[PDB]
Amino acid sequence: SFFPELYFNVDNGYLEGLVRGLKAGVLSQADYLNLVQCETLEDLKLHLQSTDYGNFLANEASPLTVSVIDDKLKEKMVVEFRHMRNHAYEPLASFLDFITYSYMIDNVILLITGTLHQRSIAELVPKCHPLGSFEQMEAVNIAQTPAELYNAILVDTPLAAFFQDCISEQDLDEMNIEIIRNTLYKAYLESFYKFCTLLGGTTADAMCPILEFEADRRAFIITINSFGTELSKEDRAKLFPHCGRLYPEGLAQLARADDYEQVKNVADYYPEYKLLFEGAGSNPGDKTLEDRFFEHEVKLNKLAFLNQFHFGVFYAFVKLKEQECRNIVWIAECIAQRHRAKIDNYIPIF
Amino acid sequence: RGKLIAVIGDEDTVTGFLLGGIGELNKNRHPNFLVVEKDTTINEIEDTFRQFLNRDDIGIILINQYIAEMVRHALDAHQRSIPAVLEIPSKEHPYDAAKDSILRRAKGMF
Amino acid sequence: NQTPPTYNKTNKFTHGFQNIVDAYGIGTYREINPAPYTVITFPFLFAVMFGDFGHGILMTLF
Amino acid sequence: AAGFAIGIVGDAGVRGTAQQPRLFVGMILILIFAEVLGLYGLIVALILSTK
Amino acid sequence: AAGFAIGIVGDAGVRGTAQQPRLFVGMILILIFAEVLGLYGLIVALILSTK
Amino acid sequence: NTASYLRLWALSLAHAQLSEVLWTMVIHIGLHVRSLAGGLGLFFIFAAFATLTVAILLIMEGLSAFLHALRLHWVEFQNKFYTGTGFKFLPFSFEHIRE
Amino acid sequence: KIIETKMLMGEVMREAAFSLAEAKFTAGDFSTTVIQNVNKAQVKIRAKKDNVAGVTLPVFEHYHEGTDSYELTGLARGGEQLAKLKRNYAKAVELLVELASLQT
C-alpha cells in the first residue's frame, strides 16, 4: 500500500540505514570457512579479527575458553540492539519492546521458582538474560515473598498484561513452572502478532509470516516432545497459539495425536512444513527436526531485508545475530572438544 | 534410598548430572552439589568437600580433575570408603590419567 | 422399542435422487419419501430456470 | 466490484492451490462467478445505451 | 490504476524472482496486462479528444 | 416461501439476458459482408462463442439453477411435510468391490 | 576391570560433553533453570556387601528409585537434545557407580 515509503523515514530513516549496515557485518559463508579452518581457539580469535568481530577477547584471561566467547558474543549484539532501542521513538520502540519481552519472559520465570524456593533476588539477577534489565524496584528486595514479586510484576513489569492468564499466585504454586512460562509466552505471541497486524502495512506482510512460523513450529515440536511425558491433551492444546496456519484446522489433530507419525500426517497438509519433516532425516549422524526449523527461520529472517520500509528488519536482525552467535559458539565448542567432523552444523546466515 | 551422589564441578558438569537424574535437596534445603565458577575460592570448595564427607547420606562424590588439584590435600588426607571420590575430565580439560589414585595404587597399570 | 434406521430402497436410477434428498437430512422413520416426486419435480423446476433449447441439447449429450 | 472479488479470490486461491492442487477447479469456478458479476453490469449498460 | 498495478506487481515480482529465477517470464506477462490497462485509457481518451 | 419461488423468474430472466448479449456481442461480430474474411473470422469467433456459452451458461448458470431449484425443494417444499430426522441405514454389505 | 572401566568413562564423557554442547546450541542457557530448580533425585545408590572371602568389602549398587526428572521444553523446546543428553549422562552415572564400587 502507500502506507510505507512516506512517513517511515522521518523518524526511522536513520535506524533503517544503521540496522542494514549492521546486517552487512554478519559472517558470510566465506568467513565461516575461514573460522572452521582453525582447530585452535587462539587461531579462531585471529580469524575473527578479520571481520567486524574481534579485539573483544583482548585484556581477558590468558587462557581462552568457550564460555568467555559465548558471553562476549551476546554482549556485542546486546549493545548494538540497546543502542538502536535507545535511539528510537514510540512508533518503533513499542515494536522493539515485544522483542525484549521474549527475553524478559524467561527472566521473570527465573525470578519466580527461586522466589518460590526461597532464593534471594540478588542471587538470581546476575543470571538474567540482558535486555530484561528490570531497572525498577519492588521486583527487587521482595524479601523472598512470592506475593511481593507477584505485585511488583503486575505494577512495574511491562509483562503484567500477559500474566492475566496466570494469576492470584495460586497459579504460581500449583502450575508447573514450564506450563506457566509456556502460557505466558502464548499470551506474548498473541498480543505481539495482533500488534503487527495493527501496523497493517509492509511490516505486517513481512513480519507476520515469521511469527506464524514460530507458532506452528512450537505446536509441532510441543506435540512431539509431550508424547513421553505427563500432560493432558487438553492442557497441551491450551498452549497452542492461535496465530498461525494450523489454527483454522490442524491444531485439533496435533492435540489428539499420540505419535510422531500423526504429527507428520498433519504436516503433510502443509507443504511448507512437509518438506521440513522429510528433510529432517533424523539419522544417527544427520540433521534433525529442530535443525531444519532453524534453517527455515533464518531463510525468513533474511527475506525480511527485502523490504526497506518496515519494522520486520529489526526483529529479523536480532534473530539472525542470535543464530550467528549460536554458529560461532558451536565452532568454538567443536574446537575445544576437537569434534571436527561435526563442524559443519552451523546455520548459514548469508 | 540409601546414599546420594554429591557433585563438585563446573557449570556444564553439574548441569549434566542433574539432568542425569542425580542430586537433590536435603530436608534442610541444602543441595548435595557445588557449582565451581572462576570466582569460587579454595575455602568454599574445601569446606564443601569436608561437609559432604561429614554427611551420612552422601558418599560417592564426583569432582572435576582440575578441582581435585586445587584441593588435592583434602582428597589424599581422607582415606575411607564411603567417600569414594571419582575424578573426571571437564568439558575442556583433557582426559585424566596422571595422579590418579588408582593408577598410583596399582603399580601394574599404565 | 428403539428408533430404527431409515431404509429407502433405491436403484441405479433413483439412488442419485435419494442422495440429493439425504444431503439435507435423513427422513423420519416411515416418513413420506419426497424422492419419487423429486425425480420429476426437480428437473422441471430446473428446466424453468434453464429453459434453453440449445444448451439443453449440450447438457443432454453430456 | 467484480475486480475486487477477482483480487481477493485470486490472492487466497493462488496460495491455497499451491497447498492443495485439488482447489484449482474450485478457484476457477469462483473466478467464473466474478466474470458473471462483471457481465451483469455490461448487460445493463448495453440495454441503456440503446434505449 | 495501471501504474499502481505496475508498482505492486513489479515489486512483488522482483522479490519472487530473487528467490525463483523462473518467475521472470510470469511477472513480465502480468505487467503486460497493466500496460494494456493504461493503453485502453489512451484509446478512449484519443477517441474522445478527436470526437 | 411464495416470494421465494421468484427464484424461477430471476434465474430464467438472467439466463435469457446473458444469452442475448453473449450472442449479440460475440458471434454477430464474427459475421461480415466480406465472403472469405467472414468465413475465416467466423471460424475463430465461433470457437470463442462456444467457449463462452459453455463457460458462462452451460456450466455456471446451469450450476446456479441446479442449486437454486434444489434449494426450493429443501426450503419451501420439503418443510411442509418432510420433517424430523432419522438414522442412515447401514447394513452388512460387501461394499469394497471396486477396490 | 577397573582400568578398562576408567578408559570407558573417558570416552563416555567425551560423548556426553559433545551432546551437552548440542543441547546448549538448541536451548541456549538451560543450565540456569536446571541448577536452580532442584528438588528430588531420580537415581539413588544402595549399599551392598560383597562377601569375596572371609573379608567382606563395601560396594555401591545403582538403585533406580524412580522419581520423575524435570520435564523441560521451555527453551527452543529442545526436548530431543535434552532427552539424548539425559540418556548420555544416565549411562555415565551407572558407569560411575560401578566405578566407585571397584575402587574398593
Swiss-Prot record, chain B:
Protein's membrane topology: Peripheral membrane protein
Region forming the signal peptide: none
GO biological process terms held by the UniProt record: synaptic vesicle lumen acidification
Gene Ontology cellular-component annotations: clathrin-coated vesicle membrane; extrinsic component of synaptic vesicle membrane; membrane; proton-transporting V-type ATPase complex; vacuolar proton-transporting V-type ATPase complex; vacuolar proton-transporting V-type ATPase, V1 domain
Tissue expr: Expressed in brain (at protein level).
InterPro entries associated with the record: ATPase_V1-cplx_f_g_su (IPR008218), ATPase_V1-cplx_fsu_euk (IPR005772), ATPase_V1_fsu_sf (IPR036906)
SUPFAM superfamilies named in the record: AtpF-like (SSF159468)
Claim: Transport is one of the keywords in the record: yes
Subcellular location: Cytoplasmic vesicle, Secretory vesicle, Synaptic vesicle membrane; Cytoplasmic vesicle, Clathrin-coated vesicle membrane
Protein keywords: Cytoplasmic vesicle, Hydrogen ion transport, Ion transport, Membrane, Synapse, Transport
Cytoplasm is among the record's keywords: no
GO MF, one annotated term: proton-transporting ATPase activity, rotational mechanism
NCBIfam families: V_ATP_synt_F
PANTHER family listed in its UniProt record: V-TYPE PROTON ATPASE SUBUNIT F, VACUOLAR ATP SYNTHASE SUBUNIT F
Function: Subunit of the V1 complex of vacuolar(H+)-ATPase (V-ATPase), a multisubunit enzyme composed of a peripheral complex (V1) that hydrolyzes ATP and a membrane integral complex (V0) that translocates protons. V-ATPase is responsible for acidifying and maintaining the pH of intracellular compartments and in some cell types, is targeted to the plasma membrane, where it is responsible for acidifying the extracellular environment.
Family statement: Belongs to the V-ATPase F subunit family.
Name of the protein this chain belongs to: V-type proton ATPase subunit F
Organism: Rattus norvegicus
Top-level taxonomy: Eukaryota, Metazoa, Chordata, Craniata, Vertebrata
Curated annotation (Swiss-Prot), chains D, E:
Sites marked Essential for proton translocation: 35
Segments on the Cytoplasmic side according to the record's topology features: 11-27
Keywords: Cytoplasmic vesicle, Hydrogen ion transport, Ion transport, Membrane, Synapse, Transmembrane, Transmembrane helix, Transport, Ubl conjugation
Superkingdom field: Eukaryota
One GO term (biological process): synaptic vesicle lumen acidification
MF annotations from Gene Ontology: proton-transporting ATPase activity, rotational mechanism; ubiquitin protein ligase binding
Modifications made to the protein after synthesis: Ubiquitinated by RNF182, leading to its degradation via the ubiquitin-proteasome pathway.
Tissue specificity field: Expressed in brain (at protein level).
Coiled-coil stretches noted in the UniProt entry, renumbered to this chain: none
Subcellular compartments: Cytoplasmic vesicle, Clathrin-coated vesicle membrane; Cytoplasmic vesicle, Secretory vesicle, Synaptic vesicle membrane
Regions of this protein lying in the Lumenal compartment: 49-51
Any Gene Ontology CC annotation: vacuolar proton-transporting V-type ATPase, V0 domain
Transmembrane segments: 28-48
Self-association state and partner proteins as the record states: V-ATPase is a heteromultimeric enzyme made up of two complexes: the ATP-hydrolytic V1 complex and the proton translocation V0 complex. The V1 complex consists of three catalytic AB heterodimers that form a heterohexamer, three peripheral stalks each consisting of EG heterodimers, one central rotor including subunits D and F, and the regulatory subunits C and H. The proton translocation complex V0 consists of the proton transport subunit a, a ring of proteolipid subunits c9c'', rotary subunit d, subunits e and f, and the accessory subunits ATP6AP1/Ac45 and ATP6AP2/PRR.
Family listed: Belongs to the V-ATPase proteolipid subunit family.
Protein name: V-type proton ATPase 16 kDa proteolipid subunit c
Curated annotation (Swiss-Prot), chain F:
Location relative to the cell: Cytoplasmic vesicle, Clathrin-coated vesicle membrane; Cytoplasmic vesicle, Secretory vesicle, Synaptic vesicle membrane; Melanosome
Residues annotated as transmembrane: 1-16, 38-76
Topological domains, Cytoplasmic: 77-99
Superkingdom field: Eukaryota
Segments on the Vacuolar side according to the record's topology features: 17-37
Recorded family membership: Belongs to the V-ATPase 116 kDa subunit family.
The protein's assembly and partners: V-ATPase is a heteromultimeric enzyme made up of two complexes: the ATP-hydrolytic V1 complex and the proton translocation V0 complex. The V1 complex consists of three catalytic AB heterodimers that form a heterohexamer, three peripheral stalks each consisting of EG heterodimers, one central rotor including subunits D and F, and the regulatory subunits C and H. The proton translocation complex V0 consists of the proton transport subunit a, a ring of proteolipid subunits c9c'', rotary subunit d, subunits e and f, and the accessory subunits ATP6AP1/Ac45 and ATP6AP2/PRR. Interacts with SPAAR.
Role of this protein: Subunit of the V0 complex of vacuolar(H+)-ATPase (V-ATPase), a multisubunit enzyme composed of a peripheral complex (V1) that hydrolyzes ATP and a membrane integral complex (V0) that translocates protons. V-ATPase is responsible for the acidification of various organelles, such as lysosomes, endosomes, the trans-Golgi network, and secretory granules, including synaptic vesicles. In certain cell types, can be exported to the plasma membrane, where it is involved in the acidification of the extracellular environment. Required for assembly and activity of the vacuolar ATPase.
Protein name, as recorded: V-type proton ATPase 116 kDa subunit a 1
Full protein stretch here: 735 to 833 of 838
